């Protein structure tokens, strides 16, 4: 699924994530936008042969099992593909572990390079919550 901006938002706002470990919801959106472009299907391999998945791009080498990234932990309990669904309930779930395990939202590059210290609130704009 791709999602619209504020239908992400309003889906985000209903699982918890608004000011989750205080980050406001403009935060959780911008992160989603530039991790996957709001698309539930989107994958990416990484150099270390770890792979990530889903609207916000989690680690298969820390939080989930995809069956072929040797010595990696499952943190999040759940096979790396149910981060790929249509229902974002999953993804958010595990996205709570990680941003709850001390580096908070620097866990995700794109949001420490494109989002962090940047008017994040735009990205609620408009929409009806
Ligand atoms: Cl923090
Ligand atoms: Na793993």
């Given at each position: 699924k791709v999602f619209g901006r504020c239908e992400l938002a309003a889906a985000m706002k209903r699982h918890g994530l608004?000011?989750?470990?205080?980050?406001?919801?403009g935060n959780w959106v911008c992160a989603a936008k530039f991790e996957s472009?709001?698309?539930?299907?989107a994958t990416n391999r990484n150099t270390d042969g770890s792979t990530d998945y889903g609207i916000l791009q989690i680690?298969?080498?820390?939080?989930?099992?995809?069956?072929?990234?040797?010595?990696?932990?499952?943190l999040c309990n759940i096979?790396?593909?149910?981060?790929?669904?249509?229902?974002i309930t999953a993804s958010v779930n595990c996205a709570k572990k990680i941003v709850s395990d001390g580096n908070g939202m620097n866990a995700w590059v794109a949001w420490r390079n494109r989002?962090?210290?940047?008017?994040?609130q735009a990205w609620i704009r408009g929409c009806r919550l």
């Open positions: 608004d000011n989750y470990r205080g980050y406001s919801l472009n709001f698309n539930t299907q680690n298969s080498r820390w939080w989930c099992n995809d069956g072929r990234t040797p010595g990696s932990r499952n096979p790396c593909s149910a981060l790929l669904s249509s229902d989002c962090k210290g940047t008017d994040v």
